[PDB]
Amino acid sequence: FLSTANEEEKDVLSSIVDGLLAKQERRYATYLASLTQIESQEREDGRFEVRLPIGPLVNNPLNMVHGGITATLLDTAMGQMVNRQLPDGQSAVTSELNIHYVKPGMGTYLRAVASIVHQGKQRIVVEGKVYTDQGETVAMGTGSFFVLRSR
Amino acid sequence: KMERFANEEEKDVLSSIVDGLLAKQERRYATYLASLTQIESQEVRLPIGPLVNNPLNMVHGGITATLLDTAMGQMVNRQLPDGQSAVTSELNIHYVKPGMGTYLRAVASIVHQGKQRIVVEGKVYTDQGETVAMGTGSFFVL
Amino acid sequence: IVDKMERFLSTANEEEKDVLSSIVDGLLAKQERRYATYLASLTQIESDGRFEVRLPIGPLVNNPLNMVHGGITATLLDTAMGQMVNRQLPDGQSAVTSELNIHYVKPGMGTYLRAVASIVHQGKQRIVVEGKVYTDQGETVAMGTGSFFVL
Amino acid sequence: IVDKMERFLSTANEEEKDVLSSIVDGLLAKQERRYATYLASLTQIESQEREDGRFEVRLPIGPLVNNPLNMVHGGITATLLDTAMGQMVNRQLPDGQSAVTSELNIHYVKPGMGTYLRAVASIVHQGKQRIVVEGKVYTDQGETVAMGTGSFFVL
Ligand SMILES: CC(C)(COP(=O)(O)OP(=O)(O)OC[C@H]1O[C@@H](n2cnc3c(N)ncnc32)[C@H](O)[C@@H]1OP(=O)(O)O)[C@@H](O)C(=O)NCCC(=O)NCCS
Secondary structure, eight states: OOBTBOHHHHHHHHHHHHHHHHHHTSSSOOHHHHHHTOEEEOOTTSOOEEEEEOOGGGBOTTSSBOHHHHHHHHHHHHHHHHHHTSOTTOOEEEEEEEEEOOSOOOSSEEEEEEEEEEEOSSEEEEEEEEEESSSOEEEEEEEEEEEOOOO | OOOOOOOHHHHHHHHHHHHHHTTTTTTOSSSSHHHHTOOOOOOEEEEOOGGGBOTTSSBOHHHHHHHHHHHHHHHHHSSSOTTOOEEEEEEEEEEOSOBOSSEEEEEEEEEEEOSSEEEEEEEEEETTSOEEEEEEEEEEEO | OHHHHTTTTTTOOHHHHHHHHHHHHHHHHHHTTSOSSHHHHHHTOBOOOSOEEEEOOOTTTBOTTSSBOHHHHHHHHHHHHHHHHHHTSOTTOOEEEEEEEEEEOSOOOSSOEEEEEEEEEEOSSEEEEEEEEEOTTSOEEEEEEEEEEEO | OOSTTOTTTTSOOHHHHHHHHHHHHHHHHHHTTSSSSHHHHHHTOEEEEOSSSOEEEEEEOOTTTBOTTSSBOHHHHHHHHHHHHHHHHHHTSOTTOOEEEEEEEEEEOSOOOSSEEEEEEEEEEEOSSEEEEEEEEEOTTSOEEEEEEEEEEEO
16 A cells, blocks of 8 residues: 555655665664664774765754754764774663754765764763765764663 | 565564554654654653664664654744744753653753743653653754 | 062952952861862852752852853852762762753853752762752753762 | 951961962952953963964863862863853954853863863854854873863854
8 A cells, every 4th residue: 555645755665665674684773773774884994984865754844854863873873983992792872962953954965973082981972973965064962871781 | 566575573663664654644743753653742752662772672862862852842832933943953861761661751841931042951751650861952943 | 478469459449359358258268167179168159958059149250241150150050969969879989070061041140149959860870960050039040960970 | 357367377288378379369460450350360271272273271270270189170170161162262253243151061081180271172163143162171191181062152
């Protein structure tokens, strides 16, 4: 059943499956990141960035990417980066997240870059920025992570 | 639609995905997310499902923030004119306890209302009355 | 030879003499162990039903616009939430400020500042606390949250 | 009667007597108007723009700025970052414009210690509405005492 759906509801679902398809093709991937397709990558320099293409799926009634999704993008770049600095087997959880929505998210993609400010045995402070498919800063933020210790 | 994609995890998920996408075309849900994630926007509730869980089997952070984000936004448009809307500017969020249980509840209340900027705070909770997240936000009018 | 220097009076206008007077008051008090730091001395901070610090809005605390320096406002808030957390802790444990988030609402003015604080979460590793700063009118100067680390 | 109240220097240890000495200098440099405010005057901050765009504010560390454990008061740290971020914002603004600290966020990392603190701020965004800036505080070793962001409202 797909009869009634318009253009926008067309790919807003097409991609939902390219992802549910991609999430199957490999574990360790989470749902929320699977659909939005927040692809994490590493350049030939060793750098790291979590950019993602903008689709009607991520916008709001103001037609700009959801601040909350931009939040999640930054949270990821920062989360995945933190985990890298941890011994094998360990994980971190976001303690505090502070975002500064500089400019509106629009265009092809958003790009997120993170950087460790200070790493402690328990708490890790990180800064990070989200740019546009061009270069303007969409958001800037920092946050704190804790080395998970499940009871 | 070669959507012949599968296990049970995906079974349930995609069921909400579509139960939710076709709840938007029937225009009962504002956005795709307020529906895709059954946001009981009316206070804002969040049905805790594997669709909203990170790899560590708990409500995803970006989510708990979006939940708080939304609650806060509405809360600021209730005090705004028909031709003016509030856009998040800043979002401070403290994660206190994992997002776990049947659902998440986010209550937001304005701390200060100015001609250009409004300050708001609010929390998120689990069904058993536990406090999940807590943060502040600043919204500019447009 | 400070006394030689304290001829700052030979020219001192009224507030010049009144600011100096209050400074020496606080110090004396600092000796009578009324405070822990000189910061508390000169500022004159005095501390639900019990936890709310108050700071007298004099010239020693204002900025080039005759309102309390947001710096000091934040320092006051940090004090309210700071000693508020110390109370909720065993003799063997203490806490240092980890994260401080503040939203400035109205210019700090009047005869004093009053900040009330409350624990938003008491966990093994950190204690999150929210709090607000008020005028002698009840008007909100600033609202902010804070995270405290246990040591 | 500030004089008859100098029974403070007759039960005052080196530190206490050392403090007031600075304080008097402060207040003294205050009336000569070498400083607009008492806070800046009593803390002796030195501010300046760097070759790059960033802004710098250093603050001498003395007993006057420490907390019960001879560590720079978290408040003076915040107030410093704020000061740096402010002067930064204001230097990038027209003569007929000004800015006021709207939001402030800080993450404490290492105990402020040594002989002086060095806060460094840089603009992250420059709207005509609000100005988002960012900064860091360093010890005299280069160790990061604290990191934080601040949004400023334009007037
Ligand atoms: C960040 C954090 C770990 C800081 O430590 P803290 O505040 O001292 O938390 P504590 O360790 O004291 O308590 C954690 C509680 O969560 C519980 N918990 C449940 N599942 C857990 C898990 N998988 N790992 C760790 N704790 C878990 C702990 O058992 C404990 O329960 P309790 O209240 O009965 O003691 C804590 O605030 C937290 O868990 N925040 C949630 C972060 C989050 O949900 N992030 C999502 C995006 S990654």
